[PDB]
From Swiss-Prot, chains A, B, C, D:
Homotetramer. InterPro entries: CbiT, Cbl_synth_MTase_CbiT, Cobalamin_biosynth_MTase, Methyltranfer_dom, SAM-dependent_MTases_sf. Belongs to the methyltransferase superfamily. Archaeal-type CbiT family. The keyword S-adenosyl-L-methionine applies. It catalyses: Co-precorrin-6B + S-adenosyl-L-methionine = Co-precorrin-7 + S-adenosyl-L-homocysteine + CO2. It comes from Methanothermobacter thermautotrophicus (strain ATCC 29096 / DSM 1053 / JCM 10044 / NBRC 100330 / Delta H) (Methanobacterium thermoautotrophicum). The gene is cbiT. This is Probable cobalt-precorrin-6B C(15)-methyltransferase (decarboxylating). S-adenosyl-L-methionine binds at T17, G41, C42, G43, T44, G45, D62, A91. It is an enzyme of class 2 (transferase). It holds the Pfam family Methyltransf_31. Pathway: Cofactor biosynthesis; adenosylcobalamin biosynthesis; cob(II)yrinate a,c-diamide from sirohydrochlorin (anaerobic route): step 8/10.
Amino acid sequence: MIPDDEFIKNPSVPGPTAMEVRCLIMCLAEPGKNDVAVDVGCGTGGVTLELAGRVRRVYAIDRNPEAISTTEMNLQRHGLGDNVTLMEGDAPEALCKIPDIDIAVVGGSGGELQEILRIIKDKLKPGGRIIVTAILLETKFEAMECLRDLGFDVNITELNIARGRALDRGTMMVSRNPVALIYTGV
Amino acid sequence: MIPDDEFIKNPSVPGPTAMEVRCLIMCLAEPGKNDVAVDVGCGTGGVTLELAGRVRRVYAIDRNPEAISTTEMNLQRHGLGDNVTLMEGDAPEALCKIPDIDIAVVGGSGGELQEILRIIKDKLKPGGRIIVTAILLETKFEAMECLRDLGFDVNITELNIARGRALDRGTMMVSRNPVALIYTGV
Amino acid sequence: MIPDDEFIKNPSVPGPTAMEVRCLIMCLAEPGKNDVAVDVGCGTGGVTLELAGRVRRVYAIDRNPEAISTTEMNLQRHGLGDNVTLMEGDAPEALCKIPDIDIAVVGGSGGELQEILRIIKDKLKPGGRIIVTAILLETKFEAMECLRDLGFDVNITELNIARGRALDRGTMMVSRNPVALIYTGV
Amino acid sequence: MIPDDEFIKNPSVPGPTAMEVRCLIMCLAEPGKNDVAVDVGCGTGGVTLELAGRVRRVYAIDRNPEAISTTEMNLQRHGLGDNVTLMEGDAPEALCKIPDIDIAVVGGSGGELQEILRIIKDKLKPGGRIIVTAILLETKFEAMECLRDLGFDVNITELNIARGRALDRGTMMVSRNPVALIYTGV
């Protein structure tokens, strides 16, 4: 899988999502070659890239134009993006112009989370999966609540990752900030 | 991916490895359909199952006959195991009868870790990967040292996973014991 | 400080709170010899014991009579409890009969958290501290919200602790479930 | 207790130790007013400050002159340091000039860990405590081994701490790198 350092960063744009988290998002998403996915809040483009290479069509969204831009760039350095539709703007609105989806990953919920999830429910093909990435405590609560209220069986997994940094004296463990994944039954 | 609960457990046999960990072992392994992998210390069979479905050949090992047994069982309930050679016995010895490998995962090192690693170095096809699973503090150190001494560029990632348990009052976070993955450059 | 094993447990009663968490609760509470504290949801009595030996007066509460009982016992085996008022019953009600407080620790919020906090606000002496112990995801959210809505500057620290268990083969790290502490400025 | 931000930093000098870790070091140290402690590798001076205010005599050491300097400064801004002997130089040598100790905290082992511990064993008053702070994976292993070989009953606790950072959108959890404390029985 593509490591975090082989991504082009932009200060105003957050990400890339830790590879270990991306790794898991894919396990949960169960990507299929005929699937249509939407990555709300694509940011650096980490999820989009991984999805890009495993599904039929990927619809990437972000309010931040810098994000849309960083994702396009990262799509290129890796040679992907033909099956990717980039959409700059407000998520709810962009979501209404998309076909139905088999997979929905919601990252930077930009505080319109509840609205985004309702819409996504309405377009979720039978057997579809939703995976919300949470950094803020509040998102972890809101996601769980919304999905539950939308009738899904909800689950949550928090990941605390530490990677070793080679120093001259030895190997010190460096932490990543905790990331939660709220996901619906398959 | 197959969740932890859809595995058949045996008291004397440890595992299955947390799905989140298994998920990452695959990312790191970079399974290819023409690859030959060896899962030293297959235990409940978690890694074996995931590798079974992505590579050409899998050679599963464990001193514990109960493990070998539980792995066979789990292979069946999921419909895999044709490309799997089960080998009960001592790792070093069983290793010597195997072809060369593209991927080497070492779980229950059974304290003969250093010997196992040397052997594995000697059968590692160019571009091969080694991934050691560590639960004991000492294994984390030994793996890093050995692989380094065997001339590999070593890395380590520790995972601390908490999953939510639905109670009547709410969702409580339940921790898994920390698991480290020492791995060699690709 | 008193370690977890030197406490008398009761199945129906949760606790004791990890020593590492108790240790920090004290750091945040800044116990003073002329302070009056209330420990809502005293359970096994861990926080109560620690507070007992550092402040003037301690008011311990719990709906569970088994809790009230285990705390009294634990107070004895360690020779403390003279400055401790045990109150069995419903927190909101027992809170109304208490003097003002310098320190308030809320553990088993028993789902009446929001009410408890209001009441506690109303009896908090200037320079008083509130520290909420959270195990459920929902509590972490609710505490933060409430305290914020009550006009406090809120903070949160989550603790993930692993202690080594001596085995014959080596030292394995055993995890404790994550604990959050939501606390107000001093 | 003094928070991390109320410490003066210096780039070449690491630290201060996270307050949550310092908090625990004290728990384990069980500081007494007539105790004599040594803080090997004082760095920014965090532990030294805390010990300064609770024991009779503190002997602070560091190869790094900047460290010795930052510590003195930090001692001042907080009005402590009269009972503190600062010693710049090589730990083993500086240790030989000190009286016996009740408490020994070893932070920046500067790779002479094994020698430092032997020496400390030789000056440890009956009922004395040793606490080694570990950042590097290798230190965790070395400390455990040494202390064990020196005949102590050894323990280890790893701390993974996340504190919330108030953002405009919400509260994000920010991790601290894992820290292990290897300590001897009391």
